[PDB]
């Protein structure tokens, strides 16, 4: 039982005790908890129409939802100064990006086969421009997949360390100054600001990850 695995168990303990453990009013309302997830559920459902809609948007809806839930929960409890968040390695976020891309192509290669190679040439770019575009398009396909995984994990690592580095400075300030007042609450004020940012960025980057993985699904199912 590594730190990753025990954290993953804590994730599911929280997951069930928001909507699965209310289940009593037999209505659409009756608990503000229910309003919370269906708000998120509706934001992604209409987003599923707006990005994947047209033949099978609802077919692939859960993966975007489950991944968004996975990133959302993993980013909620990540601020406490002793948060050894996701083992301080975050290597799986890269792995999630790799498997998401790798599954994306097999779906593309299964549903299109050789036609999947025609995606590198959207509208024009004739034979003189074909090798340049297919190089840019194919390298890009590797490019944003690896970038997606690294950006989320590094910023979580960056946010966690800027918790500690600033915290050590506050310890230095509150120990040296005898009678003055403006030495520690201002560094505490930045700590309050920099923690709100880390909490905020995790919410949108989960959304950004949700939008991005949605965006790549369009390219696999729909050729343009």
């Amino acid at each position: 039982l590594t730190t990753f695995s025990l954290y993953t168990i804590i994730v599911l303990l929280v997951i069930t005790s928001l909507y699965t453990l209310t289940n009593n009013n037999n209505k659409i309302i009756g608990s503000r908890w229910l309003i919370s997830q269906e708000a998120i559920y509706d934001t992604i459902m209409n987003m599923t129409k707006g990005q994947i809609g047209g033949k099978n948007w609802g077919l692939y809806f859960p993966m975007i939802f489950t991944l968004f839930m996975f990133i959302f929960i993993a980013n909620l409890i990540s601020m406490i100064p002793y948060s050894f968040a996701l083992s301080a390695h975050l290597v799986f976020i890269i792995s999630l990006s790799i498997v998401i891309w790798l599954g994306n192509t097999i779906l593309g290669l299964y549903k299109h086969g050789w036609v999947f190679f025609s995606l590198f040439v959207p509208a024009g770019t004739p034979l003189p421009l074909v090798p340049l575009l297919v190089i840019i398009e194919t390298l890009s396909y590797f490019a944003r997949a690896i970038s997606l995984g690294l950006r989320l994990g590094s910023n979580i690592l960056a946010g966690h360390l800027l918790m500690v580095i600033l915290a050590g400075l506050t310890f230095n300030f509150m120990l040296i100054n005898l009678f003055t007042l403006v030495f520690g609450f201002v560094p505490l004020a930045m700590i309050l600001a920099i923690m709100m940012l880390e909490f905020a960025i995790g919410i949108i980057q989960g959304y950004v990850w949700a939008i991005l993985t949605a965006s790549y699904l369009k390219d696999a199912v729909y050729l343009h």
């Binding site: 929280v14 453990l21 209310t22 608990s31 503000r32 909620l76 409890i77 406490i80």
Partner: protein, 85 residues
Amino acid sequence: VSTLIPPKVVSSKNIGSAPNAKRIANVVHFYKSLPQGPAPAIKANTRLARYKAKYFDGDNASGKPLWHFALGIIAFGYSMEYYFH
């Protein structure tokens, strides 16, 4: 030629009209419906039944359970981040 007789021909006429389709619908929707909030099953008893009656019911539905979750991590200081990674 005689006295016509369409005053009394509803015995077979009350089947094709649109309101009759709604008539046969909502009467079935009414008889079994519980009268006055009966059978609501307000006494929930399953494992952590106490939690089901304080916050898990949904009357509060606030940040207390996540506050309880956060305090559990605080109480586990010398179990996960201390004496271990």
